Structure 1
Amino acid sequence: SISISYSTTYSGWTVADYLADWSAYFGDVNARPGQVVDGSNTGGFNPGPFDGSQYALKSTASDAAFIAGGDLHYTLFSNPSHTLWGKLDSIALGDTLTGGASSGGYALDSQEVSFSNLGLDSPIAQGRDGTVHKVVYGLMSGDSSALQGQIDALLKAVDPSLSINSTFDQLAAAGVAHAT
């Protein structure tokens, strides 16, 4: 079962509303006026250089960031070239990357929403057509549409009445979300 944690800041928001906000902020700091862009520029694979238990990336337009967690691998120039594949267990979205290999992994300074126990598994054989690829490739430019479709399918698997249009409080009522 997908498990979701969300800050109380978004208690009344739909999933699809929050992802639109995070994507807007990724594209433009002025989507959240008041914020300074000063996150120490880190990110990459942990441990890397091309495989890890996490892949993390922060916008350069803002300190919006994401952390993909699982068992991930990237092919570079090897056939299926430029494919991200493996197991995608979770996607955490928020503000500013901290940590890295030497602290036990990347974390977010402000973790806003986190989607976990995802069970996504894409094999190398599907190349860049794989789901894990599409999800994390979208997020690298702040495009949360591939992630959004996947959160939808997984919620409907828990309950065909839950969707990216359910608010986090409703998902919490459903036993799927947990407020933080």
Structure 2
Amino acid sequence: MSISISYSATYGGNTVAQYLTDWSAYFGDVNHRPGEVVDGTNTGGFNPGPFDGTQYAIKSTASDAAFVADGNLHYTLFSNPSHTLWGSVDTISLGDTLAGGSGSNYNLVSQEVSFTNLGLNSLKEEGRAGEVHKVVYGLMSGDSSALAGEIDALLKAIDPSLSVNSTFDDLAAAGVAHVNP
């Protein structure tokens, strides 16, 4: 299935690339790094978890920004290859004001953009070189490059004219993106 994008009308005139840069600047970096994960404040969480589920979500420690990844996800924690997120991601949703987690599915109250039918898939054995790992860990760490590259490849696979340098409105014109009510 080809990529499909939903977006808040607010961002219609933004390029996908520019939106991702800005969102990442707003989320910042949760400092999910050696020596810097010392409590539960920058781990994020799995649904149902603790180390697997159909969602991973994390809140910014710098702002209200948050994201949710939907799919079939597994985190190795200390087990070799350590600190690898692997499995499949179908959807990534970016925005503000995370809700749920506790019997409810994670969801953003302000879902700004959502990218679905991503068909990302990574095996455990790929370790931290897996596309799933790099995409999500990038977002955690203030670098939306990996996500941008993946969306870019999925748009181009539809047609070489479509890319992250298109606006959301451009992609809606091309039938690939859709404004949220």
Q: Structure 1: how far apart are the matches of 2:16 and 2:52? A: 29
Q: Structure 2: how far apart are the matches of 1:6 and 1:97? A: 17
Q: Structure 1: how far apart are the matches of 2:43 and 2:85? A: 19
* Partner residue, 1:34: none
CA-to-aligned-CA distance 1:41-64 (integer Å, 9 cap, x gap): 994111100001000001010010
* Partner residue, 2:76: 75
Q: Which runs of 4+ in 1 moved over 6 A?
A: none
Query: Any residues of structure 2 matched to 1:85-164 within 5 Å, and which?
Result: 85-103=86-104, 105-164=105-164
Please state if 1:26 is matched with 2:24. Answer: no
CA-to-aligned-CA distance 1:125-156 (integer Å, 9 cap, x gap): 21110000000011112321111111101101
Q: Note the C-alpha offset of 1:77.
A: 1.4
Contact 1:42–1:58, Cα closer than 8 Å, also in 2: no
Give the secondary structure class of the aligned counterpart of 2:103.
helix
Contact 1:43–1:100, Cα closer than 8 Å, also in 2: no
* Partner residue, 1:33: none
Q: Note the C-alpha offset of 1:177.
A: 0.3
Please state if 1:174 is matched with 2:174. Answer: yes
* Partner residue, 1:65: 66
* Partner residue, 1:45: 46
- What letter matches 1:23 in structure 2? S
- Percent identity reads 79
Change in CA separation of 1:121 and 1:42 when aligned onto 2, cut-off 3 Å: closer
Contact 1:43–1:97, Cα closer than 8 Å, also in 2: no
CA-to-aligned-CA distance 1:24-56 (integer Å, 9 cap, x gap): 11129xxxxxxxxxxxx9941111000010000
* Partner residue, 2:85: 84
- What letter matches 1:53 in structure 2? T
TM-score, normalised relative to structure 2: 0.89
TM-score, normalised relative to structure 1: 0.89
Contact 1:92–1:113, Cα closer than 8 Å, also in 2: yes
Q: Structure 1: how far apart are the matches of 2:83 and 2:96? A: 27
Contact 1:97–1:106, Cα closer than 8 Å, also in 2: yes
Contact 1:64–1:96, Cα closer than 8 Å, also in 2: yes
